[PDB]
Structure formats: structure tokens, C-alpha cells
């Protein structure tokens, strides 16, 4: 049994030791330390040799690893500075699959055109609207950002519609997001690195946002394009079924959390699971449900020892990356 | 010491406006009158005041919706759908269909009190599956490994036995075979709303929200229809002969155009997630909704769209500045049945 | 290949399920096609699930307390504090936070105390003050988003979406100072030892207003315990004003009340000292027999406020045989409806 | 297109661009945490809280006008800024105890308000340890084994039995000193005594007593100490704890302060008591909240700092920061960036 004792600053300011001793601190600090162990286990197994097919069918030529890591995050996380932390993960090819919402895709792309700014939660809606300043928490995203996005996007959508009509090509969210990653051609973009490293980005509700607004506007031109979500479901589910092992790292809740968990039901559950969300169990929401709820469904395995950290991900994810993904890249070099 | 302290704590205060509401709860010495009790939630404060404000907002929507208005009295989708003076968008999450609030939503749809529904895959499937088999009251603290061994799925303190889903598969596969045939032969493009209309027609059960939505030409939009048991069925089904394509772009055109062509719009959002953003985003197209009630447990501090206040939506133009949006911070199972008692149900009773 | 993918997946997703017990409750909400019947609607909260089910379980627990409380029992039918207090078969401890008294809930608590349906109260300094201050002047409905600097310049104090004008406190000072002069005199001349409960009994007698919880608590010999009574306006007045408030005597009084009880029920609206103090008193008798918690706190931060009732069972503050119930909700939304289905129904039945 | 493509005003030239820390630059924790300011949401609040506490600490070291001594404790010395630190009992049950102890040990805070549990668990940890358990452990099973649960932490019941053995003799002396010397006990006086008696450099209460930092607890009877006080009163009547004298001490400390700063971990009486003391001097100058409380229920616990401004408990010119978080996650890191950096600098 582990004795409760925090870090003693009489020993000096050692961040690595401080965060190790989160294990003996208790409450969510202990969950932080358990989450570091779970992710380091995923990253370790992922570098091991394994039996069978070393290729995955989607995308074409995607290599398989001992452990398939599914990374899920909400749109607000991309809107915040956590985007740089997620980009680092995808850039260094440390995750195999992404699930995010329309917001998670567009804000990442829009940031390559124009920045977002620190505001406050208590700014008045009518005053902000008069000035075309959109509020996401304490973050300002000027509406000119979206105007620039429209200018950038329509020519790409014209090409996509042409490829649909001429080549009988069936667009899915993941195929479209792969394309927008290739087009943005920016080493600061998560979507760019996902395209480069053949990490598919699935977004069943991709119409729910600016990309939606543009697709809607684009349709008047010549009828528009079609986005099939059934094919994309085949892709994510098959990836899980064909995996040697799976880990899930879910930041936030909503569709992203359920989709990744559902895909892992197809293989009778994930082997490793970290949740980093602020949701609560009392309302009966999937968002606030505990990892042990997912075990009842068979979406997380019984031998797995899932960890959930109840915290804002902007506070804890950058520190998780410091202790896991970043340490792993530093060790390899 | 005492003189400095008195200056800070003894400060004189301005006169309050003459219209100001006095805080006074319901006095049970007057007897048990539920209508009076819930009216006096207005002078109770905190969320109780928000409950009373929400009753007023929904009753305003329902009142305006009965009125005459100028212009086109038809909406393009579904075909031949009549337009009212206010278009009411009802949004709910999957767990609210897994709860008994399903019966409250069904009553609204059956009585043609709302014009448009947005819900998730769960919100559709659970409603259909409840016509085949029941869900049961369990507890939140039931062990996952033990429940899994027994094929008992847990959703909060509710048990959905996995045989319910096996039955769903038996029921759904033949319908998907017909849908695929209609896609191949008639060059028909399926969307979530078109598929949910079809499943409503097939279930043919007066206990189903989806049945009444079909019957009353109330479209159900679900952009992420593949996220659930329906997706699982869709997955398995694709191996039989290739499968069905579900286009989300056409369904976006339908909901956005419904908003753009509305005389007025009200939004009633139970929960957060895609449902909330999708309805709010459709109303951006007309420069915001005229009336808005949120009933969710989300918090602002994490910056999530889910936990955001209605005034955030005003900044984007998804809710009008004129609008006086109300959020109740509560579990919908506690407050929504009582909202229906004071709003929708009162309206049907008054009419009949 | 394709065939193996779909057949592996079907095995995981199509698992057969065990039979549910025959007494299992089917999830079914209230059907408004049956008409608007609030009593039936709230009964069927039991089969609605999530917190609605907890509401229905809480109604049953409180109705059990009120039922047992009317029964005959064995032994001493008197409690030592206050002097000449009648013991019932169940002692009900009511706890509530200051904000609840700030809200319209106060009228619901006053009704309970007025009709002598609870035996003991624990609240904070605010819970005592606001109730007294509402006899002198009213509180108004404002909004959560009102600016602090603007409100301060106007002497308007904000408590959630409720406004308490600072003149209310000035009036309180005028009213309280003469009472504190008398109390101090009684301390000096009669060697009297003041406790929070003794002082709150006195302020109840002085306010002499049938709208006041504290007035009815005094009248019905329902003790009000407030260990941190210095934490507020009463504190401010005691600061400006030579009286000693002993909290050790008051602790003996609440603990002995628990130890000498035939049965105990706890009804806790909120969290904080109120919750910990009532739960601690019941540890002395190896736990309460019935317990309803109505609060918004969460477990994850390890707070006493957010702890679930099962955690208390670990301490022995709540009994193993008890079936405690917690509703995760704002009390202003649920407490008046609990009173409609429990305390009010009970008074109507008699 | 008219509604969705509306043109936007230019942002001020000083506006902060949202950019998180790039791990391509390597693992630098000081740079990472500086970059929380541009990160957004709570991360931004973390960075603003570091600035507020560093302002308090920096100001505290400077010279100021007037009396340089405080009345309570008698030998207490006043500083340019008086820092009031508040914490709930669960943070003392956690390893954050070691972080609080470091603050008090290095005389970096002047006043302390906590609950009975915040005092008890600090002393009991010098007698026997607490262990890491889980939130989901069954109450009946734990009770059968005499294991008390606080969140995911186990406090074996023998810990409290040892406490009782340690505390009763001390209480006997306190009662003797009340009867013979006509001494009036307050919570702060009793907690000072317990700190002296524990005589253990791991204890917050030990360092508080040694550095003349007072610990106020208006509801010091609410817990194991109260239980001991209850049993002990049956011998010869027991001790008397006056809360009015202790109110005079904390209020006067604030009223005589050149400047005041508040650091509140959690809510409850601790938060209101410190805020109320500062109301006497027309509010605190600097304020950091770390709690998980929400505004919606109207509780004082979940109230934003701007509510406290309406009452005059926090000043208008102050720029209060709340971090919405479990303090076990953020407080150790706040100490790394503020209090520890300060001790390292001097
Ligand atoms: N405003 C925007 O940024 C924006 C932009 C365009 C589209 N959208 C759309 O809005 C919809 C709703 O967003 P969503 O579904 O991605 O998420 P959401 O807002 O529904 O959040 C899901 C849940 O995740 C948790 N969570 C969120 N942020 C967290 C954080 N920082 N730390 C910890 N937990 C956190 C919360 O419990 C929350 O309820 C999406 O469909 C998206 O496409 C949003
Ligand atoms: N657990 C299930 O019931 C279940 C089963 C099948 C499908 N799904 C899928 O899970 C995904 C995510 O679920 P979702 O988006 O429908 O909801 P969700 O669980 O993500 O809830 C989103 C937010 O709604 C609010 N909320 C939830 N329940 C509430 C209540 N009772 N009262 C008030 N507010 C409440 C909360 O703020 C919560 O963060 C969906 O794509 C859905 O199809 C879930
Ligand atoms: N701002 C005020 O209203 C005010 C005024 C004067 C005195 N005070 C003092 O503030 C201190 C703190 O207040 P407290 O200890 O009474 O409670 P609190 O404000 O600390 O509330 C504690 C917990 O109770 C729960 N809760 C509160 N209100 C609720 C509600 N309406 N519904 C459901 N759950 C609810 C929440 O989980 C909260 O975290 C006390 O010492 C009190 O005397 C407050
Ligand atoms: Cl095509």
C-alpha cells in the first residue's frame, strides 16, 4: 500500500520528481500519475514486434503497430493552446487514429490563416456580435478568420465536386479531412501531419460547423458534394477489429468519446484507456460516464485498468505529454 | 479599528427599481397547489427562477406558433410541410430517450407541438428498441465486469439488456436490405432524416417518438447517425451486398433552409453536444433564434460548447440580441416533465 | 479479409444477456395523455431514471421518517436540551446552507419548523441572519452576471441572482445591538454562558415574527446549532459590540440529542459545516437510520461536501441498514416539491 | 452569407495570440507553465494566478509605513502585505499537506484558516500514515475492517485511537490552566498549543506555532477534536472555546494590514471567514481562488470572485483569479512557480 506524502520543496524544484509523487498525493493527482503509467505502457507496447499482418487497409499503406492508439479530443481543445500538444503527438507519429468534431478540424486549419486571441468568459454577447467577435470560453475568434477560411475553402470544394462528377469518387469526412490537411501544407497543422503520417481523422458530424456553412453555400453553385459516413464507419471499426492491441486517450466527451469506444466494442474492448474530462455521472450522460460504464458494454476490457482524470484538459494534457509522449521522443534520440 | 471597519460594512445602498421582484417562496399553509407553487418559482431565486422564466419563454413560442403570419405558409422539407408563425426546434441527447423523458418527448411530437427534431444515434435507436423490449432501473455503482459477463449494458442507473440489441438487429436488417435495393434501383440518396422517417414508418408503434415524427412530417436530423447500435447494424449490413450511403450534406441543406425560411424560431435544447450546436448553427443562417431555453448540466469553465451560457451563442449570432434566453442548470429528468406540465400539456388541454 | 472482420465483430456486439429479476422496474415516464396529475407525475419519477428516480426514493425515505416519528416507543420521552423538549420515535435533523435562506426556500423551511415536523436544525451564520433580516426588509431577484464594482458602488450585495441591499444590514445592526447589550449584561450579572444555540433561541424570541424560521424554532423548542456563528453579519455586529460564545457546550447538546434518540433521520440541503456537524453527531450513536442529501457537490475532489452517502457509511455516520438517498440538484428546484409530497401531505393527513 | 460572413473589428495591438508550448523545443517545465497564459481556459487562469501570488510575495518583502508589529500573536511582525491562506480538510488528507507545510515552515504566509479536519489530519499524520485507496470501495466492507474513506484515501481507525491517546492528556492540562489561571481558550489558542505539543517538523500546525502564524477555526468542534472534547468534558466539565475573541483577532489583523492577499483552496467557512475579515478593510488587494465550486446553485462556495467584489470583500482595483480545478493537481505546481521560486531567489 502507498503512503500519502506530497513533494517536499525543501528538496528543491524538480518537476519530474514532483509529478512522479502525484501518485502519493491522492484525489485527481493520483489519477494523473496512473494516467502517465497507462500512456507509457501504450507507447512501450507500440514499439514491440508482434505476429500477423503489419498493414492496415485504411488509409492505403498505413503500417500497423503492436498497439493502435486512438486519440480523441473536443473542438474547444483545438481552439485552446492544446492544439500545439496534439500536433506534436501526430507530427511524431505517436498515435494511429484521430476522432474529433468539425470544430476540431476547422480551427486547426483556420489558425494557419489567422490567430485566435485571449479574451474573458464574462464579455457581453450583443457587444461582441456587433464587432463580429465570436467567443469560445475566454478565447476570441474574430469573424474575419472565417471569411478568410471561406476564401481558402471554396476553390478546394470546387475541385472535390469536379472529382465526384468526373471520377465517380465518394467523399467521406476522413477523405475530405485528409485532403484539407494536404492543401493547408503547414507544419503547425494537426490535419497536415495526420495526412503526412497516414493518421486518419474521423468526424461523423463534419457538417456541424464552418465547414458545414461553406458546404451549404457551395451547394448552390452546382448542387454540391456528398459526404458518406457509412464508409467511414467501416474504416474505423475495421481498424479496431484488425488491431493487435488498442489504447484510447479521450480528451473531452461527446461523439468523439462514444465513437472511439464503439469501434473498440468490435474487438470486445480496448486494452488501455485514459479519459481526461470534466463530465459527472449524475445526469446519466455518456459524456460524464465512468470508464467502468464502458466495461459493462464491452467497449473497454475487463483486464484493463482504466484511468479518468477529472480536470480541464488545458491544465493537465500538456503535463501528460511532458511525462509520456515527449519523454518517449527524447529517449529515442 | 472599529471606526474603519464600520465605514466598509455600513455602506448606504441605492433604492431598488419599483418593479423589482421580492424573494418569497410558496407558503404550504395555503394548501398543496402545484400550479401556484411552480408560478412562485419566479420569486424563489437561483434555478427555480430560471424554471419560471423557461415556462414563460416556451408558452410565448407555443402562443406565437398558433398565430397568423405573412408570406409563404409551406416549407420545402419534408414535402408539403406547413409553416407556422414560429418554428420550434427540439433537441435532446441519447440519455433522455434512455430515461422516461422519452414519454414526454413522444407527447410533444404526437401532438404536433414542435416542427424539427435533432438528436444523436442513441436518441433514435433507444426509442425504436423500447418498442421491442424494455430498459430497467439499476444503479450507477454496478460493477462493469459482472454486468458485461451477463450482457447487461449500463447507461447511468438504467440497464439495457444486450438481447434488446439482438432483437434490434433482427428487426433492422430486412429494412436496410429494402433501403439498399431502393438506392441501387431508384438511384435514391439516403440521409439520416430520410432513414429515421423510414424507421418511424416501419416501427408503426404509437409509443415511438420516431413513429409520430414520421406521421406528423417532423424531420429528425442526426449527422452522426453511425455513432451507435444503428451504426453497428449498418456496419454488419455493408458486408452482405455493399451497404447504404448516408449523405450528411443534403440533411445540412434541409435544416439550414428550414431556419432561413422560418417566420420566427424557438430552440428547446435538453443536453449538449452535436444536437445543441447543430440547431444553434442552423439559426445562425437567419441571424439567430427569437426564443431559446437550455436545460443542461454543463459548466462554462472548460470552454466547451456544451457548458456554454446562452449569451455565448449571442456573440456568434446563433441567438438574437433581442432574445431573452433562459438556461436551467439541472438534470432534464427532474425539470422537463414539469416544464411539459406547465407548457405543452396546458396548451393541449386549453385547445381541447 | 472482409469475412473475418464482420464475424469477429458480430460475436462481441451480439452477445446474449442474462434474465432480469421478475421484480425489476421498467423505465416508463408519465404519459400526459392521462391529463395533468402532479402527484402521479412525481410518483412515476421512480420509473424515469437518473436523478428523477432519486427524487422518488427521497420522498419514500422522508415519508418513512415522518411515519416512524408518529409511533409509540420505549424509554425516556424527554430530551435534556432545550429544557422540556419532547422526544419522538425518530429525531429529524434538518440542515441547510445560507443561500437556501437567501432564496425563497426559507418559506418551505419555516413551514416545516412552524408545524413542528423536525426536532433539530444546523445552519451557518448566514442561514440565521438572512431569515431575521427578511423580517426587517426584503431581498430582490437580480441576475448572476451583474458587475461587482457597479453593485458595490450602489451598496447592493449579490448572492447568486438575488440582491440584498446593504441598508438591510444597517437595519439589522440597529435591531441587534440593543439585544447584544442585554445578553452581555446577563453574562456579567448572572454568570450566564452564551452558546450559538442559546443566542439564536434569543434572536428568534426577539424577532417575534411568524414569517421567521428562528421565531418558530424558539416557539417549538427546536434548537438551532451554528458552530461558526461569527462568520457573517452577526460576526460583524459581535466584533463592533464583550460576549463569549462557547461552542463546546453546544457540541455536547447536539451529540447528546443524537445519543439519546430512539431513531434519527437526516435531511441535508447543501454541504459544509452543517452536513459534517449533523453527520458527526450521528456517529456517536453509530449512524443515522434514514438519510436524504440534496446538494450539487461532486465526489472527484475528495470534499466532504461532494461525498456520496456510501462514504459516510464507512465512518459509521450513517448506518449499514440505512438506505440513504442523494439528489444531485439545486435545492430551490427540488425541495419545494419534496415538501409537497412529504411534510405538506403529512400535515394535510392530520 | 450576410449573417455568416459578417466583417469583424480589429483586435487591440497588445492582444495575446493563442499558442501552446511546442515540445519540439524540448521538455522545459518553467517555459511550458509560462505558456499556460497563451493556452486559454483554465490554463490561462493558472498563469494569471502565478502572477498574482508572485505580486503578493514581491510586495511582502518591501518596506512600508506605520506600526511594524501585529497585536495577535503578541510577537507577530507585520509585512507590507499580509497573506491569508485558506484550505479545506481534504487537502490536508492529501499530499498537498507537504506543500502547505513548506509555505508555513518558510514563513511565506501570515494567517491561516482551516476546518477541524485540516488541523486533525495534520497532527494524526505525525502518529500514523494515511494510504492511497479508491473512490469506489464499499462502505459496509470498509467499516467491517475499521478503514475510513476520504475520496480515494484510506485513514485506518487506529489512527484516531492513537490521536485520542495523544490528545486527552493535553486537554487535561488545558482544563487545569482554564480553572487555575482563569485562561479563556479560543480555537487559534488551542491549535497553537497542539502545534507546540506535536513538536514534529512534518506538521503544518508545528510550523504555524513556531513562526507565530495563527490558525483560526470557528467550527473546531466539528470533528475528531470535538469528539475528544465531548468525551473529555465528562471528567470535570471540560474546556470552553470562545469564537468571538478569535473573530476580533482575524478582523483586527486585516484592519491593521498595509496590504492583504488571499489564497483560498476550496470553499466553506474558510473562504467566507477570510473574505469577511477583509471586508472590514474594504477588501483584499490580491485574490486567488482554487476550487471546483459552480455558481448556478447560488452557493457562497461556487461564487466567482466578482461576487465578493459586490460585498466589498475583494477590492474593485484588484484583479481576482479563480482556477476551476482539484487543488491536488494545480497547487503543487503553483508552489513550484511562486513560493518555491521565491525561497530559491533570496
Ligand atoms: N465553438 C466551437 O469551437 C465550434 C466550432 C465549430 C463547430 N463546433 C461544434 O460544436 C459541437 C460540440 O462540440 P464537441 O462535441 O466537440 O464538444 P462539447 O462542447 O459537446 O464538449 C463535450 C464534453 O467534453 C467535456 N470537455 C470539453 N472540453 C473539455 C476540456 N477542456 N477539459 C475537459 N473536459 C472537457 C465536457 O464534459 C463537455 O460536456 C461539435 O459537434 C463541433 O463540431 C464547435
Ligand atoms: N449512453 C448512451 O445513452 C448512448 C448510447 C448509444 C449512443 N450514444 C452516443 O453517444 C454520443 C454522445 O452522447 P450525446 O451527445 O447524446 O450526449 P452526451 O452524453 O455527450 O451529453 C452531452 C452533454 O449534455 C448535457 N446533459 C446530458 N445529460 C443531461 C441531462 N439528463 N440533463 C441535462 N443535461 C444533460 C451535459 O452537459 C453533457 O455534457 C452520441 O453520438 C450518441 O449517439 C450514447
Ligand atoms: N453569500 C452568502 O449567501 C452568505 C452570506 C453570509 C454568510 N455566509 C457564510 O458563508 C459560509 C459558507 O456557506 P455555507 O457553509 O452555508 O454553504 P456553501 O455556500 O459553502 O455551500 C456548500 C455546498 O452546498 C451545496 N449547495 C449550496 N447551495 C445549494 C443549493 N441551493 N442546492 C444544492 N446544493 C447546494 C454545494 O455543493 C456547495 O458547494 C457560511 O459560514 C455562511 O455563514 C454566506
Ligand atoms: Cl458519388
The secondary structure of chain D, three-state, reads: CCCCCCCCCCCCCCCCECCCCCHHHCCCHHHHHHCHHHHCHHHHHHHHHHHHHHHHHHHHHCCCCCCCECCCCCCCECCCCEEEEEECHHHHHCCHHHHHHHHHHCCCCCEEECCHHHHHHHHHCCCCCCEECCCCCCHHHHHHCCEEEECCEEEECHHHHHHHHHHHHHHHHHHHHHHHHCCCECHHHHHHHHHHHHCCCCCHHHHHHHCCCCEECCCCCCCHHHHHHHHHHHHHCCCCEECHHHHHHHHHHHHCCCCEEEEEECCCHHHHHHHHHHHCCCCECEEEEEECCCHHHCCCCCCCHHHHHHHCCECCCCCCEEEECCHHHHHHHHHHHCHHHHHHHC
> How far is CA A50 from each of CA A247, A303, D308, rounded to the nearest angstrom?
16, 20, 60
B297 CB within 6 A, ligand 2:
yes
- Residue found under cell 500573536: D73
Spatial CB neighbours of B121, under 8 Å, sequence gap ≥ 6: B94, B222, B224, B225, B226, B227, B228, B229, B230, B231
The single-letter DSSP state of residue B112 is T
Residues of D in contact with A312 (CB under 8 A): 41-43, 324-325
Chains in touch with B (≥3 Cβ pairs < 8 A): A, C, D
Rounded to the nearest angstrom, the minimum Cα separation between B48 and chain D is 10
Cα separation of D197 and C104, whole Å? 48
In chain B, which residues are last before a break of more than 2.5 Å from C to the next N? Answer: none
> What DSSP string runs through B211-246?
HHHHHTT--EE-TTTTSSHHHHHHHHHHHHHS---B
Q: Within chain C, what is the greatest distance between any pair of CA atoms?
A: 97
Determine contact, residues A163/A154, Cβ cutoff 8 Å.
no
Q: Using the CB atoms, write b or e for B68-94: b if 16+ within 10 Å.
A: eeeeeeebebbeebebbbbbbbbbbbb
Q: Quick one: CA dihedral C272, C277, C282, C288, positive or negative?
A: negative
Number of neighbours of residue A30 by Cβ within 10 angstroms:
26
C223 CB within 6 A, ligand 3:
no
Q: Take residue C256 and report the three cell numbers written for it.
A: 447528546
Instruction: Find the distance separating the first CA and the last CA of chain C, reported in whole Å.
Output: 75
Q: What are phi and psi of D134, to 5 degrees?
A: -155, 160
C227 CB within 6 A, ligand 3:
no
Cα separation of C92 and B123, whole Å? 42
The H or E element spanning position A159 is: helix A144-167
Pinpoint the alpha helices (H) of chain B: 2-9, 34-39, 46-65, 95-98, 101-110, 121-129, 144-149, 163-186, 192-203, 209-215, 229-241, 249-260, 274-284, 310-316, 332-342, 344-351
Q: Which ligand is nearest the CA of A207, by number?
A: 1
Number of neighbours of residue D261 by Cβ within 10 angstroms:
26
Could you tell me the fold of the domain covering A9-332? Deoxyhypusine Synthase (3.40.910)
- Residue found under cell 502545534: D195
Spatial CB neighbours of C257, under 8 Å, sequence gap ≥ 6: C79, C80, C81, C91, C119, C120, C223, C281
Instruction: Find the distance separating the first CA and the last CA of chain A, reported in whole Å.
Output: 36
Q: Take residue D299 and report the three cell numbers written for it.
A: 452557493
Give domain D23-345's CATH architecture. 3-Layer(aba) Sandwich (3.40)
Mutate to test the interface with C, among A122, A237, A266 (most CBs of C within 10 A): A266
Give the distance (Å) from ligand 1 centre to CA of residue B274: 9
Number of neighbours of residue A39 by Cβ within 10 angstroms:
24
Question: Which residue in B312, B318, B331, B114 sits closest to B212, CA to CA?
Answer: B114
Rounded to the nearest angstrom, the minimum Cα separation between D136 and chain B is 8
Cα separation of B77 and B82, whole Å? 10
- Residue found under cell 452543517: C274
Pick the atom of ligand 3 nearest to C228's CA: 41
Q: Take residue A244 and report the three cell numbers written for it.
A: 493487435
* Residue B266 bridge partners (DSSP): B88, B291
Question: Which residue in C321, C195, C334, C198 sits closest to C267, CA to CA?
Answer: C334
Q: Take residue A61 and report the three cell numbers written for it.
A: 499503406
Q: What are phi and psi of C182, to 5 degrees?
A: -65, -45
Q: Using the CB atoms, write b or e for B139-177: b if 16+ within 10 Å.
A: ebeeebeebbebbbbbbbbbbbbbbbbbebbebbeebbe
- Chain D residue nearest residue A14, CA to CA: D336
- Residue found under cell 453593485: C151
Spatial CB neighbours of D189, under 8 Å, sequence gap ≥ 6: none
Number of neighbours of residue C86 by Cβ within 10 angstroms:
10
Q: How was this structure determined?
A: X-ray
Residues of A in contact with B94 (CB under 8 A): 286
- Residue found under cell 424509554: C75
Cα separation of D219 and A321, whole Å? 43
The backbone region for D41, taken as left when phi is positive above 0, alpha when psi lies in -120 to 50, beta otherwise, is left
The H or E element spanning position A72 is: strand A68-73
Cα separation of A196 and A190, whole Å? 10
Cα separation of D91 and D68, whole Å? 32
Q: What are phi and psi of A322, to 5 degrees?
A: -55, -40
Pairing type for strands C264-269 and B74-75 reads unpaired
Could you tell me the fold of the domain covering C2-349? Deoxyhypusine Synthase (3.40.910)
Cα separation of A131 and A142, whole Å? 9
How many Å is the Cα radius of gyration of chain D? 22
- Chain D residue nearest residue A151, CA to CA: D5
Q: Take residue A186 and report the three cell numbers written for it.
A: 503547414
- Chain C residue nearest residue B20, CA to CA: C140
> How far is CA A143 from each of CA A133, B276, B311, rounded to the nearest angstrom?
6, 21, 17
Q: Using the CB atoms, write b or e for D36-58: b if 16+ within 10 Å.
A: bbbbbbbbbbbbbbbbbbebbbe
Query: Reported resolution in A?
Result: 2.3
Question: Which residue in D281, D345, D267, D332 sits closest to D311, CA to CA?
Answer: D281
Question: Which residue in A11, A40, A34 sits closest to A275, CA to CA?
Answer: A34
- Residue found under cell 494510504: D131
Cα separation of A198 and A95, whole Å? 10
- From the list B28, B44, B51, which residue is nearest C103 (CB)? B44
Rounded to the nearest angstrom, the minimum Cα separation between A258 and chain B is 7
Binding-site residue positions of A for NAD(+) = 74-76, 101-103, 208, 253, 286-287, 312-313
Number of neighbours of residue A11 by Cβ within 10 angstroms:
10
Question: Torsion angle, CA of C201/C205/C209/C212, rounded to 10 degrees?
Answer: 0
Q: Take residue A260 and report the three cell numbers written for it.
A: 472511439
Determine the 3-state secondary structure of A246 from DSSP: strand
Instruction: Find the distance separating the first CA and the last CA of chain D, reported in whole Å.
Output: 60
Determine contact, residues A25/D94, Cβ cutoff 8 Å.
yes
Is D105 exposed, middle or buried, given 0-12, 13-18 or 19+ CB atoms closer than 10 A? Answer: buried
Number of neighbours of residue C174 by Cβ within 10 angstroms:
9
Determine contact, residues C130/C106, Cβ cutoff 8 Å.
yes
Spatial CB neighbours of B263, under 8 Å, sequence gap ≥ 6: B69, B70, B71, B83, B84, B85, B86, B87
Determine the 3-state secondary structure of C103 from DSSP: coil
How many Å is the Cα radius of gyration of chain A? 21
Determine the 3-state secondary structure of B329 from DSSP: coil
Domain boundaries, chain B: 1-351
The single-letter DSSP state of residue C318 is B
Question: Which residue in A215, A275, C287, C239 sits closest to B6, CA to CA?
Answer: C239
Strands (E) in C8-155, as ranges, are 78-79, 85-86, 91-96, 120-122, 140-141
Number of neighbours of residue A167 by Cβ within 10 angstroms:
8
Determine contact, residues D213/D249, Cβ cutoff 8 Å.
no
Determine the 3-state secondary structure of B291 from DSSP: strand
- Cis upstream peptide for D313 (omega within 30°): no
Determine contact, residues D251/D281, Cβ cutoff 8 Å.
no
- Residue found under cell 465486469: B145
Question: Which residue in A304, A198, A287 sits closest to A251, CA to CA?
Answer: A287
Q: Take residue B119 and report the three cell numbers written for it.
A: 438528436
Determine contact, residues A160/A83, Cβ cutoff 8 Å.
no
The H or E element spanning position B155 is: strand B152-155
Q: Take residue A278 and report the three cell numbers written for it.
A: 470534466
Determine contact, residues A6/D96, Cβ cutoff 8 Å.
yes
Cα separation of B80 and B58, whole Å? 26
Spatial CB neighbours of A318, under 8 Å, sequence gap ≥ 6: A81, A82, A85, D20, D21, D32, D36, D39, D43
Cα separation of A34 and A30, whole Å? 6
Counting every residue written for chain B, the total comes to 352
- Residue found under cell 402562443: B63
The single-letter DSSP state of residue B164 is H
Cα separation of D63 and D79, whole Å? 8
The H or E element spanning position A309 is: strand A307-310
Cα separation of C219 and C341, whole Å? 26
Chains in touch with C (≥3 Cβ pairs < 8 A): A, B, D
Q: Quick one: CA dihedral B306, B312, B316, B318, positive or negative?
A: positive
The backbone region for A209, taken as left when phi is positive above 0, alpha when psi lies in -120 to 50, beta otherwise, is left
For ligand 1, atom 4, name the residue with the nearest CA: A103
> How far is CA B327 from each of CA B47, B295, B330, B335, rounded to the nearest angstrom?
9, 6, 9, 12
Residues of B in contact with C103 (CB under 8 A): 23, 25, 44-46, 48
Q: Which ligand is nearest the CA of A212, by number?
A: 1
Q: What are phi and psi of C256, to 5 degrees?
A: -65, -40
Determine contact, residues D229/D254, Cβ cutoff 8 Å.
no
Do A207 and B245 lie within an 8 Å CB cutoff?
Answer: no
Number of neighbours of residue A208 by Cβ within 10 angstroms:
29
Question: Which residue in C221, C197, C214 sits closest to C136, CA to CA?
Answer: C214
Pairing type for strands B74-75 and C325-328 reads unpaired
Residues of D in contact with C312 (CB under 8 A): 139
Pairing type for strands B81-82 and B74-75 reads antiparallel
- Residue found under cell 402545484: B34
B1-351: CATH number: 3.40.910.10
Pick the atom of ligand 3 nearest to C332's CA: 31
The H or E element spanning position B294 is: strand B291-295
Question: Which residue in C72, C124, C48, C122 sits closest to C92, CA to CA?
Answer: C122
Chains in touch with D (≥3 Cβ pairs < 8 A): A, B, C
Determine contact, residues A220/A156, Cβ cutoff 8 Å.
no
Q: Take residue C318 and report the three cell numbers written for it.
A: 450513517
Q: Take residue B147 and report the three cell numbers written for it.
A: 454486468
Give the distance (Å) from ligand 3 centre to CA of residue C274: 10
Cα separation of D263 and D286, whole Å? 9
Cα separation of A259 and C242, whole Å? 67
Rounded to the nearest angstrom, the minimum Cα separation between D55 and chain A is 20
Determine contact, residues B219/B78, Cβ cutoff 8 Å.
yes
Q: What are phi and psi of B335, to 5 degrees?
A: -100, -35
Amino acid at each position: 500500500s502507498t503512503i500519502i506524502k506530497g513533494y517536499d520543496f525543501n528538496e528543491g524544484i524538480n518537476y519530474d520528481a514532483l509529478l512522479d509523487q502525484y501518485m502519493s498525493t491522492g484525489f485527481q493527482a493520483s489519477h494523473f500519475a496512473q494516467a502517465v503509467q497507462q500512456i507509457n505502457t501504450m507507447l512501450t507496447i507500440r514499439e514491440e514486434q508482434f505476429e500477423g499482418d503489419h498493414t492496415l487497409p485504411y488509409p492505403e499503406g498505413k503500417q500497423k503497430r503492436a498497439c493502435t492508439i486512438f486519440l480523441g479530443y473536443t473542438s474547444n481543445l483545438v481552439t485552446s493552446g492544446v492544439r500545439e500538444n496534439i500536433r506534436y503527438l501526430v507530427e511524431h507519429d505517436l498515435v494511429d487514429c484521430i476522432v474529433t468534431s468539425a470544430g476540431g478540424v476547422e480551427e486547426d486549419l483556420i489558425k494557419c490563416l489567422a490567430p485566435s486571441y485571449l479574451g474573458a468568459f464574462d464579455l457581453d454577447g450583443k457587444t461582441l456580435r456587433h464587432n463580429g467577435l465570436n467567443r469560445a470560453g475566454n478565447i476570441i475568434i474574430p469573424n474575419n478568420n472565417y471569411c478568410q477560411f471561406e476564401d481558402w475553402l471554396m476553390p478546394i470544394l470546387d475541385s472535390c465536386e469536379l472529382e465526384q462528377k468526373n471520377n465517380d469518387f465518394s467523399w467521406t469526412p476522413s477523405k475530405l479531412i485528409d485532403r484539407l490537411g494536404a492543401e493547408i501544407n503547414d507544419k503547425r497543422s494537426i490535419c497536415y501531419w495526420a495526412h503526412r503520417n497516414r493518421i486518419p481523422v474521423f468526424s461523423p458530424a463534419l457538417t456541424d460547423g464552418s465547414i458545414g456553412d461553406m458546404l451549404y453555400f457551395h451547394s448552390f453553385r452546382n448542387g454540391g458534394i456528398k459526404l458518406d459516413i457509412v464508409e467511414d464507419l467501416r474504416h474505423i471499426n475495421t481498424m479496431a477489429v484488425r488491431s493487435n492491441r488498442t489504447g484510447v486517450i479521450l480528451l473531452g466527451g461527446g461523439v468523439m468519446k462514444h465513437h472511439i469506444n464503439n469501434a473498440n466494442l468490435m474487438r470486445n474492448g480496448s486494452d488501455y484507456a485514459v479519459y481526461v474530462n470534466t463530465g459527472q455521472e449524475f445526469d446519466g450522460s455518456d459524456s460524464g460516464a465512468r470508464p467502468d460504464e464502458a466495461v459493462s458494454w464491452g467497449k473497454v476490457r475487463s483486464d484493463c485498468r482504466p484511468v479518468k482524470i477529472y480536470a480541464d484538459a488545458t491544465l493537465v494534457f500538456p503535463l501528460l505529454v511532458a511525462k509520456t509522449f515527449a519523454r518517449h521522443v527524447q529517449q529515442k534520440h
